[PDB]
Symmetry: C3
């Protein structure tokens, strides 16, 4: 299409599709109810991302938002994706370590706040206010990462995989606010095509990279 | 109103309203926590459908979608209905057989995908792409039916009612993609008034017919 | 801004922000998994309300709805707030008394119906029909209050705090339908600025007042 970022939307679509089919095949046969949990969550994440990447690819998950005196192309379908896939990723972490239910509700709710204020900021027409929504969203993000480091001694294989995915999680999640701030939704420093490439690389890593790590671990079996 | 399909929207409204009141009365008194679960789920389904049928009846759950060179009247409120009532129906099935939590998350999530890609397809303005969304949605549907047949030996009364509702479920759910494909959202083979009648007949059967079967079974008591 | 109700939107923003930070601080340290549950739920409620009050303050959570021959300013962000915070409040009540899961699903679902039909009524352009949606929503509300009084003998400290919050809940929740009926969404008897003040006073009391009561009780610890 006439959008230079199309190629990154098509590659992300393909890679999310392929990861989904891989995990679907892989979880074939699994009977341990525990492992079953991790397979369902982990397979669903790139399945949802597949649909939202394809809706961006086809033009559906795109809208124009007037601000700073211009019609800015905003991919809102990323927030419909993240709204469901980021809590699922947190649930994977939470289940690994057998979190208390209050801690899980804390994470899911802070996550909802994170993504929904990101979406409000994305669609806000007063330029300055976009960054107020960014800051609140970033603060929800920092609460989540705090809880992942200070809110949780289980068996050695659980701990190790959990420590690895936790570190993956802090590194990739932390890059999202930066990308948003310098890209088309924020300061407009980086063109939309580079921005879309960056989000594609983070999304595939946090979704398909993260799940490859988890699903190859025996940490997922009781 | 000026919409010939109005009569089917009014009959579905009435029938969903009546089923809701029936199940509400019927569940009056029930103390077995197990039965309580099935009564809550099963009563909520036509209560939600009542509201969405009435919003269609009154004109609120209707929007025009330009495609194939025309303004097509699309009843989007059916997807707001299904988004909540189809997982609830699956939960009824899942609870009957004491499914593992991973299997339940699999079903709910595939269901969300099913309905949300149905909704994207319903609102997509590029005619050809409508059917890509249809196919993905149908594939989520086929995953769900697969899990209902191969993803699950409990007491005889549980098994029997579960096998009956499962068969009801495959027969009616399978008709939805066909109706969509030949009706106003898809190939436009069947007029909207006939389409609305067909969805009304399926909806009442899958919602009020299904629940009459379940709630008369002693399978719902511990 | 040019909206006289701005001051009440700014005060509610501030008060919800402050309550959120207070409860966040207060729950610092808490290790009893039970108390942890109540702290997560109770902190999340004004955190969400903070964001929705601020989105109203900044103009984002406002839309114009044509009806009765005029462009009526409708604050739709209140329904995005309530959609999540009213079930959370009900969960606090439900957990106190160790409700059965079927009773909790009953409450959450009737609540969803309550808020979603409130939102449909808020955005309906046919004046008379606005009040049909009001009545259905009020009936869902009356079901919820019924279940809170007749749908539930635990330890004395649980019962007492539960009876107090239940009474707080019936008194404040019952005022919402009245405000809606006489304010800008309904009969237009009371100007939007007074209406917004009334909702601000109810919201802070039901959210921050209610949680102060709960979180000072030892009822929240196992
Ligand atoms: C499915 C992929 C994942 C793990 C994506 C995560 C996205 C984020 C952590 C988003 C965070 C943002 C903020 C903290 C600030 C404002 C904008 C966001 C939504 C990009
Ligand atoms: C409340 C009534 C029920 C059980 C309705 C079920 C609806 C479906 C199974 C819908 C399925 C569809 C697809 C598989 C393809 C595309 C369009 C849909 C959403 C009609
Ligand atoms: C976060 C604050 C709370 C507890 C707000 C509760 C709101 C209600 C109980 C709303 C009820 C309504 C109806 C019963 C009728 C129609 C309109 C509503 C949504 C205002």
């Amino acid at each position: 299409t006439g959008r230079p970022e199309w190629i990154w939307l098509a590659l992300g679509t393909a890679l999310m599709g392929l990861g989904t089919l891989y995990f679907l095949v892989k979880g074939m046969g699994v009977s341990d109810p525990d492992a079953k949990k991790f397979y369902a969550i982990t397979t669903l994440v790139p399945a949802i991302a597949f649909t939202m990447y394809l809706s961006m690819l086809l033009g559906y998950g795109l809208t124009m938002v007037p601000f700073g005196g211009e019609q800015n192309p905003i991919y809102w379908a990323r927030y419909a994706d993240w709204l469901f896939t980021t809590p699922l990723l947190l649930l994977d972490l939470a289940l690994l370590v057998d979190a208390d239910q209050g801690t899980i509700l804390a994470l899911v709710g802070a996550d909802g706040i994170m993504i929904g204020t990101g979406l409000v900021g994305a669609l806000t027409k007063v330029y300055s206010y976009r960054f107020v929504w960014w800051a609140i969203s970033t603060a929800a993000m920092l609460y989540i990462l705090y809880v992942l480091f200070f809110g949780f001694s289980m068996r050695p294989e659980v701990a190790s995989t959990f420590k690895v995915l936790r570190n993956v999680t802090v590194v990739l999640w932390s890059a999202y606010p930066v990308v948003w701030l310098i890209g088309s939704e924020g300061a407009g420093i980086v063109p939309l095509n580079i921005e879309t490439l960056l989000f594609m690389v983070l999304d595939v890593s946090a979704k398909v990279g993260f799940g490859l790590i988890l699903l190859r671990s025996r940490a997922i079996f009781g």
